[PDB]
């Protein structure tokens, strides 16, 4: 128990709780695209979501770059769609 704390998860979590909820109440907003600020922040947010009552997921273009996204219950993504979403828009070409 000392005085002095920075760059932690706790604070981050709280912020997520407020954001998530705000998005839930907001009808106009059907989804939200979060930015990969930290490496763990991803898992943290995911938890806060599943608890809030929304759909959470992670999608990134490059293995190194991985962002987190969230969708609503009704506007939630589908199984097949989810797989394709991660793989990309339409790899049909190759």
- Phi, psi (5° rounding) for residue 30? -100, -20
Cα separation, 43 vs 22, whole angstroms: 20
Determined by: NMR
Residue linked to tokens 């991803």: 42
- The architecture CATH gives domain 1-94: 2-Layer Sandwich (3.30)
Residue linked to tokens 């760059």: 7
Cα separation, 13 vs 48, whole angstroms: 7
Torsion over CA: 62, 67, 73, 74 (sign): negative
DSSP secondary structure of 11-73: HHHHHHHHHHHHHHH-SS--EEE-----SSHHHHHHHHHHHHT-EEEEE-SSSS--EEEEE-S
Tokens of 81: 């769609």
Q: Strand pairing partners for 68?
A: 58
Cα separation, 87 vs 64, whole angstroms: 15
């Amino acid at each position: 128990g000392s005085s002095g704390s920075s760059g932690q998860k706790v604070e981050f979590r709280k912020r997520m709780e407020k954001e998530v909820s705000d998005f839930i109440q907001d009808s106009g907003q059907i989804k939200k695209k979060f930015q990969p600020m930290n490496k763990i922040e991803r898992s943290i947010l995911h938890d806060v979501v599943e608890v809030a009552g929304l759909t959470s997921f992670s999608f990134g273009e490059d293995d190194d770059c991985r962002y987190v996204m969230i969708f609503k219950k009704e506007f939630a993504p589908s199984d097949e769609e989810l797989d394709s979403y991660r793989r990309g828009s339409g790899p049909s070409s190759g």
